[PDB]
């Protein structure tokens, strides 16, 4: 199955 | 570690 | 039909 | 500044 | 201010 | 087929 | 108006 | 390898 | 490790 | 005007 | 640092 | 019609 992985960085 | 994902479903 | 679900996993 | 990262994966 | 909008569509 | 439509706006 | 389109193509 | 194709469209 | 960073800027 | 900024980094 | 900048106009 | 303007910048 297909997933979108998401992340953030605080730069 | 935490991971945030979108599941995309074709149902 | 298509739907997007939010998943949060601990790995 | 907030940066967004994403990757499409197959699980 | 920047805002993001998104919708998933079936074509 | 599944597609995502994004709109990025300034408010 | 203008939108950014994602197609996640199953390959 | 599943991939995101993205484009800019006029709706 | 490679990180592909996305940001939106208001100009 | 909104613009998209795209950066590749190696950490 | 080198980044890619892109933006959309409607003519 | 829509046009996408690309640039490579030094920051
Ligand atoms: Na595949």
Swiss-Prot record, chains A, B, C, D, E, F, G, H, I, J, K, L:
Positions of post-translational N6-acetyllysine modification: 3
Compartments, record wording: Cytoplasm; Nucleus; Secreted; Lysosome
Tissue: Lens as well as other tissues. Expressed in myocardial tissue.
Residues annotated as transmembrane: none
Role this protein plays: May contribute to the transparency and refractive index of the lens. Has chaperone-like activity, preventing aggregation of various proteins under a wide range of stress conditions. In lens epithelial cells, stabilizes the ATP6V1A protein, preventing its degradation by the proteasome.
Self-association and partners: Heteromer composed of three CRYAA and one CRYAB subunits. Aggregates with homologous proteins, including the small heat shock protein HSPB1, to form large heteromeric complexes. Inter-subunit bridging via zinc ions enhances stability, which is crucial as there is no protein turn over in the lens. Interacts with HSPBAP1 and TTN/titin. Interacts with TMEM109; in the cellular response to DNA damage. Interacts with DES; binds rapidly during early stages of DES filament assembly and a reduced binding seen in the later stages.
Entry's family note: Belongs to the small heat shock protein (HSP20) family.
Clinical note on disease: Myopathy, myofibrillar, 2: A form of myofibrillar myopathy, a group of chronic neuromuscular disorders characterized at ultrastructural level by disintegration of the sarcomeric Z disk and myofibrils, and replacement of the normal myofibrillar markings by small dense granules, or larger hyaline masses, or amorphous material. MFM2 is characterized by weakness of the proximal and distal limb muscles, weakness of the neck, velopharynx and trunk muscles, hypertrophic cardiomyopathy, and cataract in a subset of patients. Cataract 16, multiple types: An opacification of the crystalline lens of the eye that frequently results in visual impairment or blindness. Opacities vary in morphology, are often confined to a portion of the lens, and may be static or progressive. In general, the more posteriorly located and dense an opacity, the greater the impact on visual function. CTRCT16 includes posterior polar cataract, among others. Posterior polar cataract is a subcapsular opacity, usually disk-shaped, located at the back of the lens.
UniProt protein name: Alpha-crystallin B chain
Protein species of origin: Homo sapiens
Upper taxonomic lineage: Eukaryota, Metazoa, Chordata, Craniata, Vertebrata
Gene: CRYAB
């Amino acid at each position: 199955k297909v997933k979108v992985l998401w992340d953030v960085i605080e730069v």
